[PDB]
Coordinates of C-alpha atoms in Angstrom, one line a residue:
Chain C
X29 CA 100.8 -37.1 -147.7
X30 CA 100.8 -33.8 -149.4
X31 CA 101.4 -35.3 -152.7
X32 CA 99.1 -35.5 -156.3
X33 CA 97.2 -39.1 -156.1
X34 CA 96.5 -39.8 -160.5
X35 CA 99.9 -40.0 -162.1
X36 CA 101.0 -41.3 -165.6
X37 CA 100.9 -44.9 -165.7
X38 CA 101.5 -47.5 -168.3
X39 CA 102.0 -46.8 -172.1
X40 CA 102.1 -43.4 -171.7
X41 CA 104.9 -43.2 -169.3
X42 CA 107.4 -45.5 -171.3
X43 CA 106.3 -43.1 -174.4
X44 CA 106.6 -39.8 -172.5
X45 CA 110.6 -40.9 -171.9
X46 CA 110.9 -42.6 -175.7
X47 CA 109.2 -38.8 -176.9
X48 CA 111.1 -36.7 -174.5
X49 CA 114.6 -38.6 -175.4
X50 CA 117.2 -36.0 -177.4
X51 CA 116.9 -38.1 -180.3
X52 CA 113.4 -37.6 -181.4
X53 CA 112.8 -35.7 -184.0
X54 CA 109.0 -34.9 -185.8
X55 CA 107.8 -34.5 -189.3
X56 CA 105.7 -31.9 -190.3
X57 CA 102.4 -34.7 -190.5
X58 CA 103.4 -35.9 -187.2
X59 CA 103.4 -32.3 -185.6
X60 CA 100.5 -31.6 -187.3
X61 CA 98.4 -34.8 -185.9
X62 CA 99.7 -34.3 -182.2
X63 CA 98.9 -30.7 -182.3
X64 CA 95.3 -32.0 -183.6
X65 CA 95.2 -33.9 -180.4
X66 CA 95.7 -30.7 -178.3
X67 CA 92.7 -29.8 -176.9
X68 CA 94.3 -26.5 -175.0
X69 CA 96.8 -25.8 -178.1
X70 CA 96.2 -21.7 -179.3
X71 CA 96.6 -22.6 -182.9
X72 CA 99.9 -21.3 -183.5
X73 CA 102.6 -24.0 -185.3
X74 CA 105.6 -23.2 -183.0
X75 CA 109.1 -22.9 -185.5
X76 CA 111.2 -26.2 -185.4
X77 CA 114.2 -26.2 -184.0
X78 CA 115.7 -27.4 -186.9
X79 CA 114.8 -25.2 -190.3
X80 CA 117.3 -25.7 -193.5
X81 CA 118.3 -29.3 -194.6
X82 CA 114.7 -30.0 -193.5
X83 CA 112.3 -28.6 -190.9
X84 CA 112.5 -30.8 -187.6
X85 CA 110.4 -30.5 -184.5
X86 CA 112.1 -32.3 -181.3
X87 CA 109.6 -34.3 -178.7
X88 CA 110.6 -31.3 -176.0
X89 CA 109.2 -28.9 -178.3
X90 CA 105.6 -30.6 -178.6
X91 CA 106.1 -31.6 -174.7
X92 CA 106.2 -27.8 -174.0
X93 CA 103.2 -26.8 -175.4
X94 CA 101.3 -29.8 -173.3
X95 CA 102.8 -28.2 -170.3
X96 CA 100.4 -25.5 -169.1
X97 CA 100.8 -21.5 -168.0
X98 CA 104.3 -20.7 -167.1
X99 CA 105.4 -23.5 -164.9
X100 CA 108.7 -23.6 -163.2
X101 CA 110.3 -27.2 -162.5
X102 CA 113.3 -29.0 -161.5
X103 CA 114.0 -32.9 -161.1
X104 CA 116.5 -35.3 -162.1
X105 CA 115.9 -38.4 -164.2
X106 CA 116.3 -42.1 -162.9
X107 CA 119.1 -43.0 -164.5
X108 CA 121.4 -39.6 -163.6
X109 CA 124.6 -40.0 -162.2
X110 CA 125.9 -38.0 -159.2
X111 CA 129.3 -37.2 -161.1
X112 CA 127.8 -34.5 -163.3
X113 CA 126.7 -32.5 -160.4
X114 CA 130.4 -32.4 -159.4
X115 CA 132.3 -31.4 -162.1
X116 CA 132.1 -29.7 -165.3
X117 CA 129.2 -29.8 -167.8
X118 CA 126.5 -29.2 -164.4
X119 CA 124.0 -27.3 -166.8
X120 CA 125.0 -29.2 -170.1
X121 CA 124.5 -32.9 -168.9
X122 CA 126.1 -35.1 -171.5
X123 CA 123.5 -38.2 -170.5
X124 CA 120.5 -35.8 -171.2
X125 CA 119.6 -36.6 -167.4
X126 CA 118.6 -33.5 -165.2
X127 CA 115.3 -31.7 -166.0
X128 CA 114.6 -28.4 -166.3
X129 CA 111.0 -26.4 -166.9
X130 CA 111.6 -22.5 -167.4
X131 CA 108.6 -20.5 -168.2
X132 CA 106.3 -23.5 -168.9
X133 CA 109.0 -25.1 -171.7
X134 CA 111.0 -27.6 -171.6
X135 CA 114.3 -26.9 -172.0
X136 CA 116.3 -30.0 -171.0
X137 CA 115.7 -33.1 -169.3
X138 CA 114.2 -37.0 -169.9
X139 CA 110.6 -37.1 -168.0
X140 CA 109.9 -40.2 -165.9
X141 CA 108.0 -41.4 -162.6
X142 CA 110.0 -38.8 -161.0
X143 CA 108.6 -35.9 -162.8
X144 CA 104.9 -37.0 -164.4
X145 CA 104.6 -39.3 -161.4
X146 CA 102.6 -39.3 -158.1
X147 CA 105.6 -37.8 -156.0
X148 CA 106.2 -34.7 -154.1
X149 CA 107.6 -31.5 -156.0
X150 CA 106.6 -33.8 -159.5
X151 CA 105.4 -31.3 -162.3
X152 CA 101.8 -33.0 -162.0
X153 CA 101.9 -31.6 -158.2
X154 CA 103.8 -28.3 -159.5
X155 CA 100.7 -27.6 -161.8
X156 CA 98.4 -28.0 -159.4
X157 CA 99.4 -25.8 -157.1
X158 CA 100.4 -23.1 -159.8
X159 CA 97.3 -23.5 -161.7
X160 CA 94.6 -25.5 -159.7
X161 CA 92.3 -28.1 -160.9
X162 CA 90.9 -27.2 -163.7
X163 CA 94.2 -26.9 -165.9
X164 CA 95.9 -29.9 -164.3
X165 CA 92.5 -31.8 -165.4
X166 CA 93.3 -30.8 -168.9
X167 CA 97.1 -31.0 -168.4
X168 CA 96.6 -34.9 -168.2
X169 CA 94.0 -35.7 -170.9
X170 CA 96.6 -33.8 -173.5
X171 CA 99.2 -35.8 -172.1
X172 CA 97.4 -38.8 -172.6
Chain Q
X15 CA 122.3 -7.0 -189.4
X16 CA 121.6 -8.5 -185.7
X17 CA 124.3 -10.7 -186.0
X18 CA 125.6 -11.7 -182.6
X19 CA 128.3 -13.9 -183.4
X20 CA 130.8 -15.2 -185.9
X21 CA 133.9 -17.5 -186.0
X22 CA 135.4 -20.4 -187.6
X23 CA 135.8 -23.4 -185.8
X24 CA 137.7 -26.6 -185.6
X25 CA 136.4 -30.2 -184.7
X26 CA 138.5 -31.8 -182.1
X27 CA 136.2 -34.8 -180.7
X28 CA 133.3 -35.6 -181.4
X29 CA 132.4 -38.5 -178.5
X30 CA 134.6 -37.9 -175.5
X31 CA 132.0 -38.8 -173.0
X32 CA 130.9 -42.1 -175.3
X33 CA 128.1 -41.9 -178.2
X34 CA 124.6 -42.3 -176.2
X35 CA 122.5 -41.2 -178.3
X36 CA 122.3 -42.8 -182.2
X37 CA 121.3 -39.2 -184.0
X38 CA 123.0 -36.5 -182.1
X39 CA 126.7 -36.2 -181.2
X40 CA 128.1 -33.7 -179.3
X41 CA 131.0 -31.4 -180.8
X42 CA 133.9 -30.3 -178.9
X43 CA 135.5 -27.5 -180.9
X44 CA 138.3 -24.6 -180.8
X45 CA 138.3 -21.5 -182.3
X46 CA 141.1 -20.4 -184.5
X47 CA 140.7 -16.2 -184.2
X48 CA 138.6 -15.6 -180.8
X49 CA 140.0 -18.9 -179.0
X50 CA 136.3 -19.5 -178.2
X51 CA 136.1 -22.9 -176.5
X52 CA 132.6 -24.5 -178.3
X53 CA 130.2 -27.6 -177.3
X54 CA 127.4 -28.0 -179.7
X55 CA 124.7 -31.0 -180.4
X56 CA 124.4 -31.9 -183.6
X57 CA 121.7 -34.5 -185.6
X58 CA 124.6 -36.4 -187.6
X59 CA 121.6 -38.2 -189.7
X60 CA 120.8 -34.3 -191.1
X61 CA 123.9 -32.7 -191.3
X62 CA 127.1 -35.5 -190.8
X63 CA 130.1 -33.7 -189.0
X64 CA 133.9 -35.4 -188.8
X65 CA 137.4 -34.5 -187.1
X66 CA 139.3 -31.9 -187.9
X67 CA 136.6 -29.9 -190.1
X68 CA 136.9 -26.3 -191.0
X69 CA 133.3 -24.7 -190.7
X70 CA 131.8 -20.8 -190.2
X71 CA 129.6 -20.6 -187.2
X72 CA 127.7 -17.8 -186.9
X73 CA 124.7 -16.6 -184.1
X74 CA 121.8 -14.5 -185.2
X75 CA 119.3 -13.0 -183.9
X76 CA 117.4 -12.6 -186.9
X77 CA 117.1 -14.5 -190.2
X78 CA 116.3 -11.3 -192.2
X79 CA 119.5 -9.6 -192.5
X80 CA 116.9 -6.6 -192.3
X81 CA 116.4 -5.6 -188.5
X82 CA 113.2 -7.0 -188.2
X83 CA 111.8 -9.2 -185.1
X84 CA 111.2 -13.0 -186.3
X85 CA 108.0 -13.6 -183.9
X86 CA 109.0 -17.1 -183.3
X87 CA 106.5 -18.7 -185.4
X88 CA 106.2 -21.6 -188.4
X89 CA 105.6 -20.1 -191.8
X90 CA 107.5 -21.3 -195.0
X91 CA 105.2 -19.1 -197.2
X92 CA 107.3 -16.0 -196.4
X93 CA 109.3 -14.5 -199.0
X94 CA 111.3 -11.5 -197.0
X95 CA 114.6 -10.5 -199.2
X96 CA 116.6 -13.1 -197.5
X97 CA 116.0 -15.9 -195.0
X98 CA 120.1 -16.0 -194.4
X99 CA 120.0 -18.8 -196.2
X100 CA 123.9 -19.2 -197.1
X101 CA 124.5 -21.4 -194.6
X102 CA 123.6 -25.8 -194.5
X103 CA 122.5 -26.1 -191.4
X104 CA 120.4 -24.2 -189.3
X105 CA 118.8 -24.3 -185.5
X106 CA 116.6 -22.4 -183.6
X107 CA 117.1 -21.9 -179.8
X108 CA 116.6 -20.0 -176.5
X109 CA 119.7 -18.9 -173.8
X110 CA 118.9 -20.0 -170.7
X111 CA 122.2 -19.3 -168.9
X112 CA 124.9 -16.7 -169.4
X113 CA 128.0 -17.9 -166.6
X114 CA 130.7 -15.6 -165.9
X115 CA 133.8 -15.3 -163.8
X116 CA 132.9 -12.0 -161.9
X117 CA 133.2 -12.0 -158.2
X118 CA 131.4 -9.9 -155.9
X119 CA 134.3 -7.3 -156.1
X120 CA 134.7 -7.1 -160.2
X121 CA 133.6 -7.5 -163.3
X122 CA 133.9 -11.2 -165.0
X123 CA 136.4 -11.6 -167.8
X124 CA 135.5 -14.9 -169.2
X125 CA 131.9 -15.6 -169.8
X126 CA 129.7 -18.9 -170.8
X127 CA 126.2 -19.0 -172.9
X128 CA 124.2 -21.7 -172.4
X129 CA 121.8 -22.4 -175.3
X130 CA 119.3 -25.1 -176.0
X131 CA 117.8 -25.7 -179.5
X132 CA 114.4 -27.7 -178.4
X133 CA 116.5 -29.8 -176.9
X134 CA 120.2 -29.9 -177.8
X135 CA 122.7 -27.9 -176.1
X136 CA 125.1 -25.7 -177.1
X137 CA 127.9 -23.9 -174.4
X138 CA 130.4 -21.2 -175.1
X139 CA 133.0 -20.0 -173.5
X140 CA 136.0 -17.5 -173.8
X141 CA 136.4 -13.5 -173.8
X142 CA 133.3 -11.5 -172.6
X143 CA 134.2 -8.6 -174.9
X144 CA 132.7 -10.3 -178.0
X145 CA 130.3 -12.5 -176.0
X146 CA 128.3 -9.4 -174.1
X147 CA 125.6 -9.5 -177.0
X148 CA 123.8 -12.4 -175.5
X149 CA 120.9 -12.0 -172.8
X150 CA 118.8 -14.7 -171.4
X151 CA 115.5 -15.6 -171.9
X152 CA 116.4 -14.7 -175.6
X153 CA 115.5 -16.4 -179.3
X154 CA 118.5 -17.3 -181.1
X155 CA 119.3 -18.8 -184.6
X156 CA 122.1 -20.9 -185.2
X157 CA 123.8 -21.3 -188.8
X158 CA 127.1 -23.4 -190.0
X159 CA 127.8 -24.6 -192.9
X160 CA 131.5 -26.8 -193.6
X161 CA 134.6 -24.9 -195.3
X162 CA 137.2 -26.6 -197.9
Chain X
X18 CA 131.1 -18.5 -140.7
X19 CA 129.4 -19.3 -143.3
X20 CA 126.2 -17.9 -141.7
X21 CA 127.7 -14.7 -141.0
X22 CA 129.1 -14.1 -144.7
X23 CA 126.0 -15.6 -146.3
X24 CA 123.5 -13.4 -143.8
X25 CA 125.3 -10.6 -142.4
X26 CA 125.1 -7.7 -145.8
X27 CA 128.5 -6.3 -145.7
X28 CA 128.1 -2.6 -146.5
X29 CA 131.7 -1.9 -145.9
X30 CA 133.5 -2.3 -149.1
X31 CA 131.0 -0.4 -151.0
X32 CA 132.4 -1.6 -154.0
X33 CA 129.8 -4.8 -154.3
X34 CA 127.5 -2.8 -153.1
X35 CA 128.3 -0.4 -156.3
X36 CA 127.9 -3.9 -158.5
X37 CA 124.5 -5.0 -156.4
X38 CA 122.6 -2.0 -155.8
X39 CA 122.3 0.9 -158.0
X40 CA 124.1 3.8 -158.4
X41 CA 121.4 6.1 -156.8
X42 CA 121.1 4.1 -153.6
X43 CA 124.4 2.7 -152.5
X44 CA 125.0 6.2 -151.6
X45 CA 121.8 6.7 -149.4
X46 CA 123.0 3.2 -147.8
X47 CA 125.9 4.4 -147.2
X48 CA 125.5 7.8 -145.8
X49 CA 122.4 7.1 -143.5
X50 CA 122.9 5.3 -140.3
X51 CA 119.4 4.2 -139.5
X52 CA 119.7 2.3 -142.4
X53 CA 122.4 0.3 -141.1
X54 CA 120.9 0.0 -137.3
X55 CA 117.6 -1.7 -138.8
X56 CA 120.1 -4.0 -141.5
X57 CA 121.7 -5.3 -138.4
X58 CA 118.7 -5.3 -136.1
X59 CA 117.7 -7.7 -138.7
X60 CA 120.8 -9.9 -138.0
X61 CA 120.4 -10.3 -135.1
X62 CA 116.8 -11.6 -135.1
X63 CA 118.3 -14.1 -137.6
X64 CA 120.7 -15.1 -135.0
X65 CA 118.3 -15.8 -132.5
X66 CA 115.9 -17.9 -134.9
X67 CA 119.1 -19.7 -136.3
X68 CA 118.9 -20.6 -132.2
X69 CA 116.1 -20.9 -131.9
X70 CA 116.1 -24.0 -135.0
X71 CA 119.0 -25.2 -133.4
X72 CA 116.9 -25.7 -130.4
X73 CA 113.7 -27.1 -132.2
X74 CA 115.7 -29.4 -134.7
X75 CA 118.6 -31.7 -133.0
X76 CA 120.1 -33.7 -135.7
X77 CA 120.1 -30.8 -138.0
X78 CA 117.2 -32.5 -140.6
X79 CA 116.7 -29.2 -142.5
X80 CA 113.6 -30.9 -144.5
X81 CA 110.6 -28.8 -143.2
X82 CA 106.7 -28.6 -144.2
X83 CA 105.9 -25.6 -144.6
X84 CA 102.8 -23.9 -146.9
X85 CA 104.2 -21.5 -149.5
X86 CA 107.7 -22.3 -151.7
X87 CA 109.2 -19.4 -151.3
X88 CA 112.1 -20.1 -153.8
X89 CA 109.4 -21.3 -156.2
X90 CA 107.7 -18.3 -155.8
X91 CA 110.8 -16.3 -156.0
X92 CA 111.7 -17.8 -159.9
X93 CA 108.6 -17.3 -160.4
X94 CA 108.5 -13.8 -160.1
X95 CA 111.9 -13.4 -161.8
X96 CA 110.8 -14.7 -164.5
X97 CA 107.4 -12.9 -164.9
X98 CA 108.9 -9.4 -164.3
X99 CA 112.1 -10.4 -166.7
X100 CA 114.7 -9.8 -164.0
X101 CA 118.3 -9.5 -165.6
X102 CA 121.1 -11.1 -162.8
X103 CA 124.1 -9.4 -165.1
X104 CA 122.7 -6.0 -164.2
X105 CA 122.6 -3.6 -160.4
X106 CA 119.0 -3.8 -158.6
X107 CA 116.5 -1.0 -158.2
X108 CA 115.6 -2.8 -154.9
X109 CA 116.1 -0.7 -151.7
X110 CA 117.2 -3.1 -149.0
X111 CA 115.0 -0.6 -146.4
X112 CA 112.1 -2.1 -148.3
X113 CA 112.8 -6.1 -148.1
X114 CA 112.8 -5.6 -144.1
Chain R
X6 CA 71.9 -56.0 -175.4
X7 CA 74.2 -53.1 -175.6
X8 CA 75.5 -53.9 -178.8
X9 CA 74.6 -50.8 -181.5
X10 CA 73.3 -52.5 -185.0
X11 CA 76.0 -53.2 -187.4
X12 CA 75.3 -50.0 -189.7
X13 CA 76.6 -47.4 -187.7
X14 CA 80.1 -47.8 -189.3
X15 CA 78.8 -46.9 -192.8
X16 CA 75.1 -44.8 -192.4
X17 CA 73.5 -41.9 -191.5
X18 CA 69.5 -41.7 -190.7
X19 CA 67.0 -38.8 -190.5
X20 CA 69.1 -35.6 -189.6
X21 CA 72.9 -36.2 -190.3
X22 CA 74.4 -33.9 -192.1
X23 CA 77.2 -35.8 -194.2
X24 CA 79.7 -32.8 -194.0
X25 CA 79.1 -29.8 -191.8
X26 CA 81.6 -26.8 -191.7
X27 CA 82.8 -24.4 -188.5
X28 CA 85.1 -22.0 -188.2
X29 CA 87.9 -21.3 -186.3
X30 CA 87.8 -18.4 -184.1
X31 CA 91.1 -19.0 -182.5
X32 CA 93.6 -18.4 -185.8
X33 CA 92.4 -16.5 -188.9
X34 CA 92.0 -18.3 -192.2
X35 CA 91.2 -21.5 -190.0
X36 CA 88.3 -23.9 -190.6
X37 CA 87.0 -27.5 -189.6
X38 CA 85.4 -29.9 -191.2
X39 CA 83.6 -32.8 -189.6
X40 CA 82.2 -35.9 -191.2
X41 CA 79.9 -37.8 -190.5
X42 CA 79.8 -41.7 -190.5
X43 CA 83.5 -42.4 -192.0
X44 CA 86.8 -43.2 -191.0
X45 CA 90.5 -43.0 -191.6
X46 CA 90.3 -44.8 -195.3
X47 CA 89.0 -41.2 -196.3
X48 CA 90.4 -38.6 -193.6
X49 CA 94.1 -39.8 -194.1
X50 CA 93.6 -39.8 -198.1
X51 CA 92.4 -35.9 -197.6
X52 CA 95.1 -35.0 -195.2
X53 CA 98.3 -36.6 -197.3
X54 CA 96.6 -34.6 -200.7
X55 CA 95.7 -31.4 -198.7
X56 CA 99.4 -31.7 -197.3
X57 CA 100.5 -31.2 -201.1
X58 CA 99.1 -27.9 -201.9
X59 CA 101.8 -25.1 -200.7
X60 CA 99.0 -22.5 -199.9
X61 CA 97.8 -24.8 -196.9
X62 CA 99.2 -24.0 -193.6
X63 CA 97.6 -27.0 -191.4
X64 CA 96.2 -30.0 -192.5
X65 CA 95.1 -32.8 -189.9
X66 CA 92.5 -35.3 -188.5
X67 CA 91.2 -37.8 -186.1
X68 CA 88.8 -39.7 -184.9
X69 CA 87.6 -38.3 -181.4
X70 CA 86.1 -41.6 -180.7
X71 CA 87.2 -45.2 -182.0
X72 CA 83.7 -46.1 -181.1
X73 CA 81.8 -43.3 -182.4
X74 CA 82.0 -42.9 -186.8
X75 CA 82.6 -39.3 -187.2
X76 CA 86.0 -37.3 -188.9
X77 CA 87.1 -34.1 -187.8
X78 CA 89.7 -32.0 -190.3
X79 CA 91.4 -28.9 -189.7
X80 CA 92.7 -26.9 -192.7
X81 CA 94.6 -23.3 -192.0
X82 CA 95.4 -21.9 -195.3
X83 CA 97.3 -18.9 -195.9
X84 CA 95.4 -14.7 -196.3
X85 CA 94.7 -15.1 -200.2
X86 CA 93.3 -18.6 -200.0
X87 CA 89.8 -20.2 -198.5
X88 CA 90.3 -23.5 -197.1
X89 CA 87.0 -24.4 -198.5
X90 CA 88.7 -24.2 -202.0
X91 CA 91.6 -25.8 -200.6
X92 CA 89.4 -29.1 -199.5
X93 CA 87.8 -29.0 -202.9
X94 CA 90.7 -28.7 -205.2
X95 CA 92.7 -31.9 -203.0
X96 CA 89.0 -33.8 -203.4
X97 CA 89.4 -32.9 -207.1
X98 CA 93.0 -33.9 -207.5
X99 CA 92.8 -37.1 -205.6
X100 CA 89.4 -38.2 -207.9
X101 CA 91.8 -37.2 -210.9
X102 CA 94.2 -39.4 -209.6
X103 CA 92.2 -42.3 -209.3
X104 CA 90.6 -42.3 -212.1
X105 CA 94.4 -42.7 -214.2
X106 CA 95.3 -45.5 -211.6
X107 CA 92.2 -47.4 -212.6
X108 CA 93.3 -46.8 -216.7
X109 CA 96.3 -47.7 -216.3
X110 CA 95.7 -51.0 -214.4
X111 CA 93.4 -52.0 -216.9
X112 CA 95.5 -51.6 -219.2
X113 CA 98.3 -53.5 -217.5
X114 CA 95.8 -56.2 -217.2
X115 CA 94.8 -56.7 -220.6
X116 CA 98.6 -56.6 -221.6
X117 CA 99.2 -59.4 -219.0
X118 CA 96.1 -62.1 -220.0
X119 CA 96.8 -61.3 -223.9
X120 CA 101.0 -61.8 -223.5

C-alpha cells in the first residue's frame, strides 16, 4: 500500500502529543538529559526560546533536532477543526492544531497518529523517502 | 544597532478564542503610534500579562547592540558589552511567513509577519513601510518589558 | 476559466511580468516572437492533456499515484537554494519548457 | 539458567577499569566519562554538583542499559577549563559536603537523646 509499516505506538505516542503540546516548557537538566539520549545530536545546545526571566526550551525545540536532514512536512492534528482553514488566523491556529516541518524544524503543530504514524504522506514515510533507511532507522530509536 | 522594530502596545484581550492552554495566552494588542495590529503568545507563569497594559515591544535581530551575528547558539558564559538586557522578557524565534496585499499588478501596502518562537506564535500586521526589514527564513529576538 | 487564467501566462500587460520576471528578461519576452509561439505551443499541449484526463478520469477523482512529489520536491528546492517570493526571478520561462 | 549471579550490580572482576575517559571529537572541550559497575545513586549526585560550577557547559548521564551496570557522563566545559578538573573539583565539593551533613547530624542526635 505504499505506506511505512513500524510507526509509533504506545507510551511514546501519548508522550510525543503531551511533549509536543505549546505548553511544555524544559529546564536546563531536562534538555541536557534528552540531548544525552540523542544518539545523532552534533553537540551543539540549541538557544531556548525563552532567555531573560529564565532560560526555557519548548518540546518543538528538542522535537526538531530528533527530526533528521531538512525535512519538509505538512499534516493536520486529530482534533483540528475545519473552521480555521476558512477564516482568519489560517497560519496562526489558535488550537495549536495544523503541523508544519520547514527545513527539518518544527515550527507549529501537535504530532499524532497522523504524522509519526503508519499512514501515507506521515513524516516517518516523508523521511524515508528523503533520506532512506539508514536515517529513518535512527530517526525512530531517538524518538523512542 | 539591527533593530528591526519598535512600538508601544496596548492589551485589548487576552482569550477571545477561550484559554486552551494553562501557561500561554494569546495577546491581542493595538498600537498607539504605527497602528500595528499585534498577536503574540505569551507563558503567563514567566512573565504575567493583564488588560489594558502599556508595554515597549521591540524586534531585534541582534542582542549585541554591536552589529555582530548571534550564531544561534546556547552560551551564558558570554560577556559582550551588552546582551540588550533592558527589557523583562525576552524570546527567540524564526519568520516563517511574510503576507502582503500586493496583487499581480502592484506592490502590497499592508503586510503580515509570521513569527514562531519554538513554538508560540506571533503575527503582525499594518504599514509595509516600517515592516520591510523582515525576511523569512530569518532569527529574530523578541524583547518587552511593561510601562507605568 | 479558471484553467485558462491559472495556465495560460499572460504576457500582455507587461506590468506583472515587470513584478515576476526580471528586469533584464521581460524585455527579451516581450520583444521576441518565438518566445511567445513555443509559450503557447505549450498551452495547447496542456489543453489536450487536460482532455485527455478528462477522458481517462470520469468523476473528476484528481487523487493519482504517481512516483516523484513534485510539489515536495519543488519546497524542497526552495528552501535549499533560499528562494525569496517578495523578490522578481532570474528564471527565463524559455528554459522551464 | 539465564539468570547473571547477584554481583554484577556492585563488582568488577579481572579487567574492568572502574573509570575510563574518552574524548569528544564532535565539540571542543568535550569529554566522557564511563563507569563501571554503578548506577544512578552516584551519576545523578555528580550531574546535580557538576550542574553548579558556572565554567561547565554540559553536564549529563544515563544508563544505556537498565540491565547492564555501567554510567556514561558527558561534561563540556568552557576554553580555559578541563573537564577532568571540573569532575574532580564537584567529587571534591560533594565529599566536603557530606562529611558537614554527617557532623551536623550527629550533633543533632546527641542534643536530641541528652534533652
Amino acid at each position: 500500500s505504499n505506506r511505512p509499516v513500524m510507526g509509533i505506538v504506545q507510551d511514546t505516542l501519548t508522550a510525543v502529543r503531551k511533549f509536543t503540546k505549546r505548553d511544555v516548557f524544559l529546564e536546563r537538566g531536562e534538555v541536557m538529559n534528552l540531548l544525552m539520549f540523542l544518539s545523532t545530536w552534533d553537540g551543539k545546545v540549541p538557544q531556548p526560546a525563552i532567555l531573560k526571566p529564565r532560560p526555557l526550551w519548548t518540546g518543538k525545540q528538542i522535537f526538531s533536532l530528533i527530526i533528521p536532514g531538512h525535512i519538509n512536512c505538512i499534516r493536520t492534528h486529530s482534533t483540528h477543526p475545519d473552521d480555521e482553514d476558512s477564516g482568519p488566523y489560517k497560519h496562526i491556529s489558535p488550537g495549536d492544531t495544523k503541523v508544519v516541518v520547514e527545513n527539518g524544524e518544527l515550527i507549529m503543530g501537535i504530532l499524532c497518529k497522523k504524522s509519526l504514524g503508519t499512514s501515507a504522506g506521515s513524516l516517518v514515510h516523508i523521511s524515508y523517502l528523503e533520506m532512506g533507511h539508514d536515517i529513518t532507522r535512527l530517526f525512530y530509536s531517538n524518538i523512542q | 544597532a539591527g533593530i528591526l522594530f519598535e512600538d508601544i502596545f496596548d492589551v485589548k484581550d487576552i482569550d477571545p478564542e477561550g484559554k486552551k492552554f494553562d501557561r500561554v495566552s494569546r495577546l491581542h494588542c493595538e498600537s498607539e503610534s504605527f497602528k500595528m495590529d499585534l498577536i503574540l503568545d505569551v507563558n503567563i507563569q514567566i512573565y504575567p500579562v493583564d488588560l489594558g497594559d502599556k508595554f515597549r515591544l521591540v524586534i531585534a535581530s541582534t542582542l549585541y547592540e554591536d552589529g555582530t551575528l548571534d550564531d544561534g547558539e546556547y552560551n551564558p558564559t558570554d560577556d559582550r558589552p551588552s546582551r540588550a538586557d533592558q527589557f523583562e522578557y525576552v524570546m527567540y524565534g524564526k519568520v516563517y511567513r511574510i503576507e502582503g496585499d500586493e496583487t499581480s499588478t502592484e506592490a502590497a501596502t499592508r503586510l503580515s509577519a509570521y513569527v514562531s518562537y519554538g513554538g508560540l506564535l506571533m503575527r503582525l500586521q499594518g504599514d509595509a513601510n516600517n515592516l520591510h526589514g523582515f525576511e523569512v527564513d530569518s532569527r529574530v529576538y523578541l524583547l518587552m518589558k511593561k510601562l507605568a | 476559466k479558471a484553467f485558462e487564467k491559472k495556465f495560460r501566462f499572460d504576457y500582455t500587460n507587461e506590468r506583472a511580468l515587470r513584478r515576476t520576471l526580471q528586469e533584464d528578461l521581460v524585455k527579451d519576452v516581450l520583444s521576441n516572437a518565438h518566445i511567445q509561439n513555443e509559450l503557447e505551443r505549450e498551452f495547447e499541449r496542456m489543453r489536450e492533456d487536460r482532455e485527455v484526463l478528462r477522458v481517462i478520469f470520469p468523476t473528476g477523482d484528481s487523487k493519482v499515484v504517481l512516483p516523484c512529489n513534485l510539489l515536495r520536491m519543488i519546497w524542497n528546492a526552495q528552501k535549499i537554494f533560499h528562494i525569496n517570493p517578495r523578490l522578481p526571478s532570474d528564471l527565463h520561462p524559455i528554459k522551464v519548457v | 539458567m539465564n539468570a547473571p549471579p547477584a554481583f554484577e550490580s556492585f563488582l568488577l572482576f579481572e579487567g574492568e577499569k572502574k573509570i575510563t575517559i574518552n574524548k569528544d571529537t564532535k565539540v571542543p572541550n568535550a569529554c566522557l566519562f564511563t563507569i563501571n559497575k554503578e548506577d544512578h545513586t552516584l551519576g545523578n549526585i555528580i550531574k546535580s554538583q557538576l550542574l553548579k560550577d558556572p565554567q561547565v557547559l554540559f553536564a549529563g548521564y544515563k544508563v544505556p542499559h537498565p540491565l547492564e551496570h555501567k554510567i556514561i557522563i558527558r561534561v563540556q566545559t568552557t576554553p580555559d577549563y578541563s573537564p577532568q578538573e571540573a569532575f574532580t573539583n564537584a567529587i571534591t565539593d560533594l565529599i566536603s559536603e557530606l562529611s558537614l551533613l554527617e557532623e551536623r547530624f550527629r550533633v543533632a542526635i546527641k542534643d536530641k537523646q541528652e534533652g
